[PDB]
Amino acid sequence: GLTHRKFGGSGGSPFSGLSSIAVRSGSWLDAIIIDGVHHGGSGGNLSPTFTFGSGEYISNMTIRSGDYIDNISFETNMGRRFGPYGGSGGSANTLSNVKVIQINGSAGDYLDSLDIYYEQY
Amino acid sequence: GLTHRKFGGSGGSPFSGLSSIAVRSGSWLDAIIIDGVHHGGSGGNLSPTFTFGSGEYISNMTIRSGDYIDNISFETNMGRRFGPYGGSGGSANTLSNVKVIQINGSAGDYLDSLDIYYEQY
Numbered sequence: 001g002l003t004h005r006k007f008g009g010s011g012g013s014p015f016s017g018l019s020s021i022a023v024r025s026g027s028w029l030d031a032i033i034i035d036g037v038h039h040g041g042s043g044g045n046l047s048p049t050f051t052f053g054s055g056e057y058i059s060n061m062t063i064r065s066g067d068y069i070d071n072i073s074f075e076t077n078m079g080r081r082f083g084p085y086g087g088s089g090g091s092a093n094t095l096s097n098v099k100v101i102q103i104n105g106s107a108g109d110y111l112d113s114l115d116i117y118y119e120q121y
Numbered sequence: 122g123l124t125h126r127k128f129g130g131s132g133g134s135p136f137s138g139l140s141s142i143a144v145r146s147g148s149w150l151d152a153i154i155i156d157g158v159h160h161g162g163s164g165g166n167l168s169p170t171f172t173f174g175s176g177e178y179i180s181n182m183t184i185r186s187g188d189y190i191d192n193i194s195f196e197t198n199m200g201r202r203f204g205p206y207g208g209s210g211g212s213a214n215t216l217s218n219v220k221v222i223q224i225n226g227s228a229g230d231y232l233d234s235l236d237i238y239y240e241q242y
């Protein structure tokens with residue numbers, strides 16, 4: 001039963017807990033770095049860090065994956081892009097016309113899985 | 122429509138994009154710090170940073186709020202606790218038997234509001 005609730009008032013500027021993304025990747029994903037927090041191992045190469053602007057969110061996302069995450073790319077509502085980073089194995093799946101709220105997952109020395117929470121438009 | 126999708130396999134240790142929380146607070150909340158990213162102003166006192174364990178999430182949460190956020194406390198599924206931090210004003214609202222996925226909000230010099238995304242069990 002996924003849902004959300006607002007608390008408090010109407011002032012201020014909006015912000016998101018999903019502030020920046022980087023990855024370590026080779027032929028698959030070694031790690032995802034979320035808001036500077038490292039999730040995964042130390043292999044592969046480190047990508048640049050994508051920092052979302054105010055009012056910017058992931059609107060499209062392509063993940064190549066098998067038993068492990070092989071490739072990530074995304075696009076934002078402002079027309080900016082991240083990736084593709086990773087390899088060409090696994091199967092591709094796309095989220096289209098979304099707003100990504102959160103990225104959880106599972107990682108060891110490599111990135112096993114991602115759980116993407118989002119609104120579908 | 123709020124939903125989620127899983128990509129990848131079953132290995133590794135679970136993690137969350139929402140990996141640590143701290144606040145600045147006096148009589149109300151000046152800021153919330155999510156994964157080290159500062160959201161709000163410089164007033165009040167800095168709380169310690171709660172860092173979630175793998176597979177640990179907010180299961181219960183009490184927020185005191187009015188037109189601004191007044192107080193935050195939460196408990197995790199592992200029995201650990203954060204807060205209460207803040208003042209005693211506003212009205213209290215509780216999320217019970219949940220799994221918090223994301224904390225967004227709105228802030229200027231203080232914490233105006235929070236948008237809490239969560240699973241309701």
Ligand SMILES: OC[C@H]1O[C@H](O)[C@@H](O)[C@@H](O)[C@@H]1O
Nearest residue numbers: 025026027028029030043044
């Ligand atoms: O991504 C998995 C693996 O792919 C490549 O072989 C290299 O870049 C490694 O360092 C990396 O760990």
Ligand SMILES: OC[C@H]1O[C@H](O)[C@@H](O)[C@@H](O)[C@@H]1O
Nearest residue numbers: 146147148149150151164165
């Ligand atoms: O909480 C709002 C306000 O409360 C108190 O008066 C002080 O601790 C301030 O520094 C703080 O900004």
